[PDB]
Design a protein around this ligand. Structure first.
Ligand SMILES: C[C@@H]1CC[C@@]2(OC1)O[C@H]1C[C@H]3[C@@H]4CC=C5C[C@@H](OCCC(CO[C@H]6O[C@H](CO)[C@@H](O[C@H]7O[C@H](CO)[C@@H](O)[C@H](O)[C@H]7O)[C@H](O)[C@H]6O)CO[C@H]6O[C@H](CO)[C@@H](O[C@H]7O[C@H](CO)[C@@H](O)[C@H](O)[C@H]7O)[C@H](O)[C@H]6O)CC[C@]5(C)[C@H]4CC[C@]3(C)[C@H]1[C@@H]2C
Ligand SMILES: CC(C)CCC[C@@H](C)[C@H]1CC[C@H]2[C@@H]3CC=C4C[C@@H](OC(=O)CCC(=O)O)CC[C@]4(C)[C@H]3CC[C@]12C
Ligand SMILES: CC(C)CCC[C@@H](C)[C@H]1CC[C@H]2[C@@H]3CC=C4C[C@@H](OC(=O)CCC(=O)O)CC[C@]4(C)[C@H]3CC[C@]12C
Ligand SMILES: CC(C)[C@@H](C)/C=C/[C@@H](C)[C@H]1CC[C@H]2C3=CC=C4C[C@@H](O)CC[C@]4(C)[C@H]3CC[C@]12C
Ligand SMILES: *[C@@H]1O[C@H](CO)[C@@H](O[C@@H]2O[C@H](CO)[C@@H](O)[C@H](O)[C@H]2NC(C)=O)[C@H](O)[C@H]1NC(C)=O
Ligand SMILES: *[C@@H]1O[C@H](CO)[C@@H](O[C@@H]2O[C@H](CO)[C@@H](O)[C@H](O)[C@H]2NC(C)=O)[C@H](O)[C@H]1NC(C)=O
Ligand SMILES: *[C@@H]1O[C@H](CO)[C@@H](O[C@@H]2O[C@H](CO)[C@@H](O)[C@H](O)[C@H]2NC(C)=O)[C@H](O)[C@H]1NC(C)=O
Ligand SMILES: *[C@@H]1O[C@H](CO)[C@@H](O[C@@H]2O[C@H](CO)[C@@H](O)[C@H](O)[C@H]2NC(C)=O)[C@H](O)[C@H]1NC(C)=O
Length: 1101
């Protein structure tokens, strides 16, 4: 047909490539020969089997075939790109209608005085070019670690300039000998020349499908964007729901403006009475035999104090007092540890220049002399150094130090060229290798990639020895770094593996405990004095000693079963039990004084027993409400706070028994012997007058509750690490640095279990680099979940490395002695061994990959490869990432990483991604594991949990109140007040900055217990009244306050005030933030509700 090009007339210059001979557009080439037809179908494709009058000869096709092989390896990953590439250069040289879309701009003379072409012009549809560029745009070269466009396209980012590179005349560098120009626009009104248009194949094509790694389109777009996790609008979703609820509530109010029990009572009444007879009998038994029960108490406490002193007194460590040993994250940790070995122990050192850069010859010279000392000649007491515990990648390899010193291999560089050398090594780590032969990322070494302007560099040391010997060395390193004399301006902050455990069990706040104890003995004596001003010091002493006998009994009774209490939480029980324990002393003693005031016919023995039998249900309900609240708080699974609820539950029970039995006897003896002679309101009228405004108080307090129900969703989550460690420690500085100067994240592992990996079906579920495999494979999904999730850094797939290792192109990798299956020795650099797979036995669509028994035959030589000849050896990188027994690969690990994680909110968000992603593969047994996951397993279900525990506690309070008060209406009011205190404190939790942990969730569950003590006494007096008193509501409530109101203010109210105040001053901030602000806000909030609100509500019950 019409050909503008045909045949070769000779080379343009000596040794130059032969150039084709130009021909007129009317030239008609003869019919093709038999050999040409065979070549065209093979070299180009079967689609050319029909062409008769081609425009190319035998020399042209063989030359074309030779040239095409040049670029075949680069673009062989994606068959679509390869198919398109061949088509463009096949039609351009052999298409019958070559002249239709080809024009000769310039023709030059050859050596043989025969004209040859020097420049050419072609025209094609822009759609064709756009598709062609798209197919080969995202091809990735295995060895270059970058897009293949750099090698073939020269980094071209536009389709227009991509063809330009191909058309560039660069014969010296192997380019096209003659310039080629491509036109993307042609208004061919004349239509003399026809534009070049032909079929275009994209990676999505079924026939020419390409892997996800090759092109974006083939990757899984099945990424349903999870929604609803965050808030909606400018306010939280729940708050908007509440706000509309108030609006509709107001509209209803606007419309308002315009406009058998007897059987239960009898049974309960008999039950209530039976308790009174039971309790008075106990008092008679105790009072009638004072010495008998006093000797037993003294003897018993000595028996129990013996157990705690020697038999059992233990503490714990971070992984035993903050993680439940039954959770799923701890069953996974044990499995990973058993097979793939425990994670490395990590020591980190930060060298920080607060202002300005760090790297200077003075600082660099100084550090080189203190990093060659830690890692070479520290020699802990047992003469074990870092060289006996450090992590060695192989059997014989210098162990890993992740420091910038490794760029120079521990050789102090010269004073002149150190700046340029460091920049070059950082910019291109491949050109600056450490002694253990692996590139060091600049993010793991410096705060920022600028290097020279970095504010701090990080030194990491890895210990693969977990015996107690490694602990001994870390003691020496901790001591060495503390006393190190850094230059002026610089700073150091480090965290050895054992630093956390040492500092947690270091705070000793027992001094302040003895001060709170001293204050309450002072106050108790003052508040227990007689109406005449006389003081009874002995009674006050018994109050303090009686509570101690409860704590010691609990710590001795409970330690028998094997419970261990933490040092941190063993300093909090004394305040809690004493605040609750001493409450019943004043009520019994004070009420006893009243009985002496009137009706003195009874004697001391008869008066006290009457005092005990009268408020016994009031005391009994306090004990039963201080064990349900604590027992419900024992459902928290953190061992540190689960043992705190069990320890307090037993202490409260023992304190009650040792008060209605042992203190009653003591009181009788003290009063009988003393034989006191029979005894012969500012700020109240003002307060009493205030209660006259029933509606003003209710409206104000009601508004406070409702405005505090739209701030609950503003409460944060998580416990800050800096709080736990005591102040002035070296870990407060460290945790501050990790949040600002570290640019790497924990290395999440993706363990896969019970997978065959020997049948081709299973391998396709982890493929990430081949075409015929599944699209939802593990490698493809994890590749896509890198722009939206927290797991960003690339995945280390050992299965794709294994198959690449068998590639015949990498001949050196899989050398096998010819004629045998034995491995070619490394000392055999001769033609005595060949590749495992021949040229035609390996294809990118898994046509000849190992299967069945053959899979484990070659896996035993890849995982033992030296890795020196070619980088695809597997002995060094993936030695410990497999658990195989020459018949299966039962387990395996794929390593990834998170991003910096610079906050407590990112730690919780990251943990969610690990759980979310591990549940995206229903066909696998995958589970992700990172070192920090076990410590954040509580916040996943802390939302529903806190509602259930608090909701359960309020329900329990209502149930017991109805049984004792014998009045449903009164009980409901008490439950309504208690739930009003909890909500109010919850909103104040957001403002004060307290978060929601398992430590501040138990504190909020025992607030209902403490919040019922204030109100239970007021409510009961309202229900039960003397006959002489009027039955009108105002009279009864006024009667109640005048009777038991004083004891609440001088007792339950003020006593807790003294205890909490002392707890504010402490070294650890965990006591100041959680156990003080929570228990100090409760008293103020509960005091207002109990005194100002509750009587107003009762009067209008
Ligand atoms: C909080 C902390 C922080 C995080 C942390 O813990 C927690 O995380 C933890 C995780 C840890 C690492 C994990 C596991 C290893 C493997 C081991 O590794 C064997 C060493 C070999 C590694 O081989 C290959 O390593 C990579 C694959 O593994 C390959 O890269 C890619 O692999 C995939 C691509 O396919 C994709 O994944 C990516 O594209 C890319 O990743 C890489 O290219 C290739 O080198 C070294 O091989 C050499 O072999 C010959 C020498 O022997 C050399 O030959 C020569 O001989 C003379 C030399 O004498 C010369 O001068 C001649 O000129 C020359 O001819 C030859 O050139 C050279 O290759 C070395 C230790 C290390 C790094 C650990 C260190 C410590 C951590 C970073 C911890 C760390 C502390
Ligand atoms: C009741 C009182 C005494 C508090 C008890 C719990 C604390 C000791 C917890 C609360 C949050 C924990 C921290 C949460 C996050 C991390 C990151 C994580 O760091 C790792 O690299 C993992 C180390 C490992 O796997 O052991 C574990 C340590 C640390 C600081 C934890 C140490 C122990 C902390 C401070
Ligand atoms: C009768 C009781 C239940 C009322 C008083 C409950 C309070 C203890 C408040 C104070 C702050 C509230 C929390 C503030 C924020 C949220 C939003 C949301 O938190 C989540 O993390 C949702 C997702 C998840 O559960 O992981 C679910 C409710 C929760 C935990 C709230 C539950 C109820 C809390 C604990
Ligand atoms: C591997 C890198 C260096 C990249 C840039 C090189 C690719 C080579 C192998 C490719 C790119 C474009 C190809 C190319 C361009 C155009 C022509 C004109 C033609 O009618 C015969 C084939 C010929 C001569 C081929 C030869 C092989 C070339 C030059
Ligand atoms: C830490 O950074 C500060 C700020 O750059 C350094 O202080 C400067 O040091 C240079 C010489 O290195 C002096 O010329 C400047 O006068 C210093 N002050 C300022 C404000 O720039 C300090 O040297 C750095 N630390 C160390 C150990 O050198
Ligand atoms: C951790 O290091 C210690 C000390 O090097 C190892 O224990 C030593 O083992 C050698 C070899 O059996 C003995 O000769 C030494 O006497 C041991 N020293 C001590 C102090 O016990 C220990 O084996 C290492 N742990 C691991 C898991 O490799
Ligand atoms: C893709 O996989 C096939 C599977 O065998 C490879 O081999 C081809 O198999 C088909 C089976 O119908 C034959 O028709 C082809 O002739 C085979 N290809 C040959 C002999 O080259 C194939 O090589 C793989 N690669 C592709 C399709 O590009
Ligand atoms: C080699 O390991 C494989 C693990 O895949 C063993 O085969 C499995 O063993 C477990 C435990 O007994 C069984 O529950 C599985 O049914 C076995 N078959 C599988 C997982 O396909 C195999 O027995 C081991 N070989 C030897 C000699 O111990």
């Amino acid at each position: 047909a019409t050909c503008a090009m045909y045949g070769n007339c000779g080379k343009k210059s000596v040794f130059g490539n032969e150039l084709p001979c130009p021909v007129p557009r009317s030239f008609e080439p003869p019919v093709l020969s038999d050999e040409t037809s065979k070549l065209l179908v093979e070299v180009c494709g079967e689609e050319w089997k029909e062409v008769r009058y081609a425009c190319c000869t035998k020399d042209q096709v063989v030359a074309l075939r030779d040239n095409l092989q040049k670029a075949q390896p680069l673009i062989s990953s994606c068959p679509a790109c390869l198919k398109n590439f061949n088509n463009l250069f096949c039609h351009f040289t052999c298409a019958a209608d070559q002249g239709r879309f080809v024009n000769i701009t310039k023709v030059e003379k050859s050596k043989e005085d025969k004209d040859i072409v020097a420049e050419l012009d072609v025209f094609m549809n822009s759609s064709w070019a756009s598709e062609f560029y798209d197919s080969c745009k995202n091809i990735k070269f295995s060895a270059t670690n970058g897009y293949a466009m750099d090698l073939i396209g020269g980094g071209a980012k536009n389709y227009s300039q991509f063809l330009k590179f191909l058309g560039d005349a660069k014969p010296m560098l192997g380019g096209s000998p003659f310039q080629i120009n491509y036109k993307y626009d042609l208004a061919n009104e004349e239509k003399e020349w026809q534009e070049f248009n032909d079929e275009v194949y994209a990676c999505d094509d079924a026939q020419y499908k390409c892997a996800c790694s090759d092109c974006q389109e083939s990757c899984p777009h099945l990424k349903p964007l999870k929604d609803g996790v965050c808030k909606v609008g400018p306010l939280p979703c729940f708050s908007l729901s509440v706000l509309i609820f108030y609006t509709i509530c107001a509209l209803f109010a606007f419309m308002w403006y315009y406009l058998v029990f007897e059987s239960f009572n009898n049974e309960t009444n008999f039950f209530n009475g039976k308790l009174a007879n039971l309790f008075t009998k106990v008092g008679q038994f105790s009072v009638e035999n004072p010495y008998k029960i006093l000797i037993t108490t003294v003897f018993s406490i000595f028996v129990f104090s013996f157990i705690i002193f020697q038999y059992a007194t233990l503490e714990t460590d971070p992984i035993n007092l903050w993680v439940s040993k039954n959770s799923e994250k701890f069953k996974e940790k044990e499995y990973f540890d058993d097979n793939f070995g425990p994670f490395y122990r990590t020591e980190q050192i930060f060298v920080v220049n607060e202002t300005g850069p760090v790297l200077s010859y003075e600082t660099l010279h100084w550090w080189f002399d203190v990093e060659n000392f830690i890692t070479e000649e520290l020699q802990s007491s047992e003469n074990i150094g870092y060289q006996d515990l450090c992590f060695r990648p192989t059997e014989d390899s210098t162990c890993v130090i992740e420091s910038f010193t490794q760029y120079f291999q521990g050789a102090l560089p010269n004073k002149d060229s150190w700046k340029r050398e460091l920049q070059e090594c950082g910019k291109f780590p491949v050109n600056c290798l450490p002694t253990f032969q692996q590139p060091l990322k600049t993010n793991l070494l410096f705060s920022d990639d600028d290097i020279l302007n970095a504010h701090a560099f990080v030194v990491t040391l890895l210990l693969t020895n977990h015996t107690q010997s490694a602990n001994r060395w870390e003691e020496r390193l901790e001591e060495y770094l503390l006393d190190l004399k850094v230059p002026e301006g610089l700073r150091i902050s480090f965290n050895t593996e054992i630093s956390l455990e040492k500092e947690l069990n270091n705070n000793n706040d027992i001094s302040t405990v003895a001060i709170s104890y001293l204050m309450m003995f002072l106050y108790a004596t003052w508040a227990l004095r007689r109406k005449d001003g006389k003081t009874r010091l002995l009674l006050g002493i018994s109050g303090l000693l009686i509570v101690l006998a409860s704590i010691v009994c609990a710590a001795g009774f409970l330690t028998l079963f094997g419970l261990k209490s933490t040092l941190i939480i063993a300093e909090v029980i004394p305040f809690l039990i004493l605040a609750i324990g001493i409450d019943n002393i004043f009520l019994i003693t004070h009420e006893y004084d009243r009985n002496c005031e009137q009706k003195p016919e009874y004697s001391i023995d008869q008066k006290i027993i009457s005092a005990i039998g009268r408020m016994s249900p009031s005391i009994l309900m306090s004990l039963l409400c201080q064990t349900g609240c604590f027992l419900i708080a024992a459902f928290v699974t953190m061992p540190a706070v689960h043992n705190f609820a069990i320890y307090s539950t037993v202490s409260v029970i023992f304190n009650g028994v040792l008060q209605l039995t042992a203190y009653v006897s003591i009181l009788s003896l003290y009063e009988k012997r003393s034989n006191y002679k029979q005894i012969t309101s500012f700020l109240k009228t003002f307060y009493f007058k205030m209660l006259t405004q029933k509606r003003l108080i209710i409206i104000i307090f009601s508004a406070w509750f409702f405005t505090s129900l739209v701030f609950l969703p503003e409460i944060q989550f998580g416990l800050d690490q800096t709080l736990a460690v005591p102040q002035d420690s070296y870990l407060v500085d460290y945790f501050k640095d990790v949040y600002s100067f570290l640019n790497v994240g924990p290395p999440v592992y993706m363990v896969v279990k019970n997978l065959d990996l020997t049948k081709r079906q299973n391998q396709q579920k982890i493929c990430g680099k081949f075409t015929t495999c599944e699209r939802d494979s593990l490698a493809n999904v994890l590749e896509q979940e890198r722009h939206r999730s927290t797991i960003t850094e690339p995945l280390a797939n050992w299965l794709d490395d294994y198959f690449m290792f068998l590639n015949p192109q990498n001949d050196q990798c899989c050398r096998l002695k010819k004629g045998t299956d034995e491995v070619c020795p490394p000392s055999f650099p001769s033609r005595r061994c060949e590749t495992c797979f021949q040229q035609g036995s390996w294809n990118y669509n898994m046509s000849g990959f190992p299967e069945g028994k053959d899979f484990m035959e070659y896996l035993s030589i890849w995982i033992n490869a030296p890795s020196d000849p070619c980088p695809l050896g597997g002995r060094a990188p993936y030695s410990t990432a497999l658990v195989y027994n020459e018949t299966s690969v039962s387990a395996s690990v794929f390593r990834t990483a998170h991003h910096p994680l610079r906050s407590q909110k990112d730690f919780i968000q990251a943990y969610s991604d690990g759980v979310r992603i591990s549940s995206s593969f229903p066909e696998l047994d995958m589970f992700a594991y990172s070192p920090f996951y076990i410590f954040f397993v509580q916040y996943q279900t802390l939302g529903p949990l806190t509602l259930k525990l608090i909701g359960s506690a309020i329900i329990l309070i209502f149930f017991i109140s109805s049984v004792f008060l014998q009045n449903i209406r009164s009980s409901f009011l008490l439950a309504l007040v208690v739930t009003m205190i909890i909500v109010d404190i919850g909103a104040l939790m957001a403002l004060l900055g307290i978060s929601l942990n398992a430590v501040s969730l138990v504190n909020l569950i025992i607030c209902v217990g403490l919040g019922v003590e204030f109100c239970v006494h007021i409510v009961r007096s309202f229900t039960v009244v003397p006959s002489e008193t009027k039955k009108d509501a105002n009279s009864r409530v006024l009667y109640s306050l005048n009777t038991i109101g004083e004891s609440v203010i001088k007792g339950i109210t003020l006593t807790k005030f003294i205890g909490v105040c002392v707890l504010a001053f402490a070294q650890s901030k965990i006591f100041d933030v959680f156990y003080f602000r929570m228990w100090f806000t409760l008293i103020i909030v509960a005091a207002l509700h109990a005194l100002l609100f509750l009587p107003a509500l009762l009067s209008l019950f």
